[PDB]
Amino acid sequence: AKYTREDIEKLVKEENVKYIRLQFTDILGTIKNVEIPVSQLGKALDNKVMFDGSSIEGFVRIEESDMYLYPDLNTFVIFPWTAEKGKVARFICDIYNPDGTPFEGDPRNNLKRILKEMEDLGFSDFNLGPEPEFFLFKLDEKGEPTLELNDKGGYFDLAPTDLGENCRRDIVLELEEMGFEIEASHHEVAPGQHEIDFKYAGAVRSCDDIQTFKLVVKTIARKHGLHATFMPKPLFGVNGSGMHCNLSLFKNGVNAFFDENADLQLSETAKHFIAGIVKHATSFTAVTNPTVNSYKRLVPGYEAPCYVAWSAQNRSPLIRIPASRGISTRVEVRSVDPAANPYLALSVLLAAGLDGIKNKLEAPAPIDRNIYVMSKEERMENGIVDLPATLAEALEEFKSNEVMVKALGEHLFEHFIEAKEIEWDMFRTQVHPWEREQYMSQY
Amino acid sequence: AKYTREDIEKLVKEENVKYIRLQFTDILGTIKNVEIPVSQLGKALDNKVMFDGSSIEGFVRIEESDMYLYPDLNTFVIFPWTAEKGKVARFICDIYNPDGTPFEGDPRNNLKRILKEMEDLGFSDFNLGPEPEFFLFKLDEKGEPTLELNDKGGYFDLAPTDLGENCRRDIVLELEEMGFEIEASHHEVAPGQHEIDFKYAGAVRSCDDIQTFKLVVKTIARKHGLHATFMPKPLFGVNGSGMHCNLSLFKNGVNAFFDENADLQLSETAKHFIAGIVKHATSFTAVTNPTVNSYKRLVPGYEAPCYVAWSAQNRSPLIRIPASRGISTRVEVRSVDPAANPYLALSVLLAAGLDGIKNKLEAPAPIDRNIYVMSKEERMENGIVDLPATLAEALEEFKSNEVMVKALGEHLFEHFIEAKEIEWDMFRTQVHPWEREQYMSQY
Ligand SMILES: NC(=O)CC[C@H](N)C(=O)O
Ligand SMILES: [Mg+2]
Ligand SMILES: [Mg+2]
Ligand SMILES: [Mg+2]
Ligand SMILES: [Mg+2]
Ligand SMILES: [Mg+2]
Ligand SMILES: [Mg+2]
Numbered sequence: 001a002k003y004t005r006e007d008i009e010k011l012v013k014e015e016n017v018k019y020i021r022l023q024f025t026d027i028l029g030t031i032k033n034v035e036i037p038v039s040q041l042g043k044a045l046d047n048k049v050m051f052d053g054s055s056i057e058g059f060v061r062i063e064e065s066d067m068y069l070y071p072d073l074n075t076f077v078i079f080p081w082t083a084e085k086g087k088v089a090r091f092i093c094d095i096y097n098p099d100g101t102p103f104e105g106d107p108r109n110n111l112k113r114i115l116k117e118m119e120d121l122g123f124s125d126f127n128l129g130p131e132p133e134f135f136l137f138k139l140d141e142k143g144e145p146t147l148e149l150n151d152k153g154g155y156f157d158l159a160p161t162d163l164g165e166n167c168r169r170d171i172v173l174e175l176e177e178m179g180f181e182i183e184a185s186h187h188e189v190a191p192g193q194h195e196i197d198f199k200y201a202g203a204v205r206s207c208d209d210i211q212t213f214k215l216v217v218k219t220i221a222r223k224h225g226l227h228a229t230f231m232p233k234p235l236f237g238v239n240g241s242g243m244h245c246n247l248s249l250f251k252n253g254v255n256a257f258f259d260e261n262a263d264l265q266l267s268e269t270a271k272h273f274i275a276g277i278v279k280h281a282t283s284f285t286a287v288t289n290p291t292v293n294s295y296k297r298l299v300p301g302y303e304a305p306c307y308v309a310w311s312a313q314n315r316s317p318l319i320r321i322p323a324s325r326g327i328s329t330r331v332e333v334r335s336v337d338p339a340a341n342p343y344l345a346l347s348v349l350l351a352a353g354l355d356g357i358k359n360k361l362e363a364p365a366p367i368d369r370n371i372y373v374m375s376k377e378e379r380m381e382n383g384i385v386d387l388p389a390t391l392a393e394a395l396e397e398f399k400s401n402e403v404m405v406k407a408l409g410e411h412l413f414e415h416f417i418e419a420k421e422i423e424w425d426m427f428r429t430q431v432h433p434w435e436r437e438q439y440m441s442q443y
Numbered sequence: 444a445k446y447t448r449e450d451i452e453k454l455v456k457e458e459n460v461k462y463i464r465l466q467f468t469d470i471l472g473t474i475k476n477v478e479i480p481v482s483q484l485g486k487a488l489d490n491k492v493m494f495d496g497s498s499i500e501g502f503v504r505i506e507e508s509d510m511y512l513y514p515d516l517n518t519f520v521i522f523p524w525t526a527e528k529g530k531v532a533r534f535i536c537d538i539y540n541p542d543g544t545p546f547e548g549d550p551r552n553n554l555k556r557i558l559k560e561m562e563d564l565g566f567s568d569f570n571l572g573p574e575p576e577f578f579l580f581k582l583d584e585k586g587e588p589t590l591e592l593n594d595k596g597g598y599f600d601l602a603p604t605d606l607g608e609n610c611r612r613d614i615v616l617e618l619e620e621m622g623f624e625i626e627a628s629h630h631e632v633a634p635g636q637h638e639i640d641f642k643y644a645g646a647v648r649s650c651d652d653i654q655t656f657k658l659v660v661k662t663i664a665r666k667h668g669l670h671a672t673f674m675p676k677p678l679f680g681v682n683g684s685g686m687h688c689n690l691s692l693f694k695n696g697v698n699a700f701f702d703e704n705a706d707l708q709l710s711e712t713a714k715h716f717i718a719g720i721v722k723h724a725t726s727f728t729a730v731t732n733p734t735v736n737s738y739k740r741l742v743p744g745y746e747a748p749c750y751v752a753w754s755a756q757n758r759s760p761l762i763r764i765p766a767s768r769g770i771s772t773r774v775e776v777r778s779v780d781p782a783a784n785p786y787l788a789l790s791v792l793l794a795a796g797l798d799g800i801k802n803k804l805e806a807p808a809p810i811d812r813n814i815y816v817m818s819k820e821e822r823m824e825n826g827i828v829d830l831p832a833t834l835a836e837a838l839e840e841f842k843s844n845e846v847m848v849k850a851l852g853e854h855l856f857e858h859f860i861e862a863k864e865i866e867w868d869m870f871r872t873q874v875h876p877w878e879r880e881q882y883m884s885q886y
Binding site: 018019021026030031032033035036037039049050051052055058059061062064065066079081082084085088098215219220222223 | 597601604605606629757763
């Protein structure tokens with residue numbers, strides 16, 4: 001209980017809060033909201049504010065259906081940069097059906113659903129440590145994004161410098177003032193690319209922070225004349241952006257992946273997890289990489305995984321194990337990209353993990369200096385399968401899987417599939433310039 | 444009441460008001476005004492101010508006509524901007540004849556007429572909850588509007604951010620801190636499109652607030668290098684704008700549409716009232732949808748209605764019943780667009796409602812699924828009539844309906860048709876570029 005009804009009412013008043021953002025999330029991970037005047041804080045709470053909950057199905061809407069917003073008290077945040085006529089605060093909300101029950105088509109209420117599965121298996125927490133990467137492109141005259149990069153930095157370089165446009169700085173600083181907890185940040189591999197890493201938190205809080213963070217970013221960036229994009233593959237020839245997800249299970253407030261007396265100090269619990277992840281990656285990919293362009297980042301030549309394997313020391317492991325042990329033992333899934341919706345991502349991932357533990361699945365041998373050089377044939381002769389090559393591919397595999405379809409639930413699943421199938425069809429029917437360069441003179 | 448003579452005179456002096464706007468509306472909903480120096484406040488308040496009330500006719504104006512301006516103390520507000528050589532305030536007004544009686548051709552006086560009509564039927568209040576949607580475009584260098592939108596947001600998604608322009612916010616903030624009572628706001632389907640929704644009120648107050656809204660909007664957006672418009676379909680191939688009106692009747696301070704032990708918890712009255720809107724839609728469309736361009740929004744595929752029908756959950760029903768009951772039990776007409784003169788629309792709607800209540804009309808089958816596919820023929824065999832395709836058609840239907848004509852008033856009616864027929868006549872003789880593109884080389 002971070003705040004209570006009164007603590008918030010007291011707080012709204014102590015400060016000059018005048019505008020309330022009741023923010024949620026549609027199925028495509030897009031960050032939505034309905035805004036009220038502070039004069040509606042009461043109705044807001046009391047969970048009495050209604051809206052067209054079909055905003056959640058995204059562009060595949062069809063009819064208008066009324067739904068309730070239920071604000072999550074302990075997610076109460078006051079935005080800093082505000083203060084014009086008054087300040088602005090917010091609430092992340094859970095969408096309820098008009099009859100009282102939570103709306104099953106809501107991404108957030110789904111994570112919770114599967115977190116009940118985790119607790120019934122006997123676990124207390126499922127932690128996440130996101131490593132979200134993003135590009136900074138320059139704005140032009142007419143305030144339009146351009147293909148020009150904010151800087152020419154390389155890997156863990158000393159990016160932009162402490163003389164203005166240091167977006168990373170203000171971002172990290174602003175986030176820390178908003179109550180976040182950052183672990184560290186750094187410039188990434190390509191020029192004009194960045195990464196800020198959050199401290200670990202419980203699935204929900206971590207997912208909620210990832211949403212805010214993206215928002216916070218986009219804003220500060222515009223403030224500096226820049227464009228932030230979390231597009232996975234903005235530029236052919238340059239690195240893409242992914243969002244590795246460090247994962248851990250807890251039991252009685254004790255880390256469960258750690259076993260000092262076992263191979264790699266990794267519990268049997270830990271290894272079943274890895275096991276399930278390997279079993280389901282080619283199937284949960286259409287979710288952790290939800291866009292067409294997500295697949296342009298998933299190619300040889302960069303640090304992105306193109307095959308299902310794990311390792312503690314390799315070029316592009318879809319699963320990795322950081323060095324830290326004990327209270328910090330965790331599995332890192334390095335295929336997830338920032339285009340992915342966190343609640344859904346952690347839904348399918350948490351689910352594929354539990355499917356390993358439930359069924360004492362057996363993990364394969366850790367890969368190490370092989371995958372990349374051995375032809376897809378040699379790789380294939382082993383547990384080494386290629387991830388889907390296109391969104392259409394990822395979608396077939398997804399549907400085939402029963403434990404992944406369950407991870408969403410009939411509503412979240414029907415529509416996701418619908419929207420993505422359109423997205424692909426639009427792309428497939430499209431005639432790109434590249435083809436005209438190739439065939440228009442040659443034929 | 445709310446304000447009394449001396450209360451106002453105290454307010455003006457203390458707040459340092461120096462410029463009064465005597466505000467009113469013409470047939471085309473356009474917002475007129477005669478403006479006096481604070482020093483003339485007395486003359487004003489004694490109902491002694493005169494002006495050319497033929498301004499009410501709009502461009503159909505032929506001869507001049509001296510009329511009086513009667514301020515309404517309860518509509519007194521002080522505009523928040525202003526404060527140069529002093530502050531500004533307005534008074535919404537009723538137009539009188541030089542012989543002391545209210546001028547009929549005045550739309551505000553017209554609704555007050557049909558309202559009294561309602562009371563004879565023994566009703567207490569007529570409530571409106573409007574949801575006015577608008578587009579924000581950019582102003583060019585010359586300060587001239589362009590076809591460039593203010594953002595790329597969609598339905599309900601949190602956009603734009605709290606750093607910069609954020610018109611919607613600054614509008615609601617101004618409205619709220621200016622006496623208004625807003626419920627919520629949000630981004631709309633099309634990029635650059637926005638909607639603010641106010642708490643319900645009685646017809647007159649609700650119509651006055653709609654006229655003040657538009658203004659405050661138009662104003663705020665201009666202040667941010669933007670152009671607001673309530674033009675129904677500014678752009679082909681994107682969503683148009685509309686102003687669904689949420690209607691409810693009270694009897695002795697109690698909602699008369701509600702009824703627990705009923706079906707859908709809708710009272711017999713409700714069912715009848717609905718019945719009325721059903722049989723007058725095609726004949727009141729010309730009023731709720733007054734511009735030529737209004738009918739370019741009335742095309743299938745964009746959430747806007749096209750047939751006379753009512754549902755509780757459908758793609759784009761002319762009428763729909765939102766979830767809430769009890770006090771919130773209401774009928775929503777989704778035909779109405781912003782271009783419409785709120786006073787005329789509300790009066791033509793109240794009138795059609797009461798008519799169906801008066802003559803105990805039998806409401807038709809609520810539409811299940813599909814009015815889109817179910818072709819003309821079939822749609823007919825189900826008593827589903829199409830709205831008028833063009834302003835012309837709309838007029839021929841309005842002119843045929845005895846009760847609708849009576850809702851307007853001999854004067855209002857005569858001049859409204861006069862305007863619309865010339866408006867249509869122009870648009871019909873115009874040779875648009877589209878014709879040239881399709882025909883000039885073809886023939
Ligand atoms: N109800 C909505 O928000 C859709 C509005 C849409 N622009 C219309 O014409 O009705
Ligand atoms: Mg559906
Ligand atoms: Mg990194
Ligand atoms: Mg990593
Ligand atoms: Mg005349
Ligand atoms: Mg709307
Ligand atoms: Mg509506």
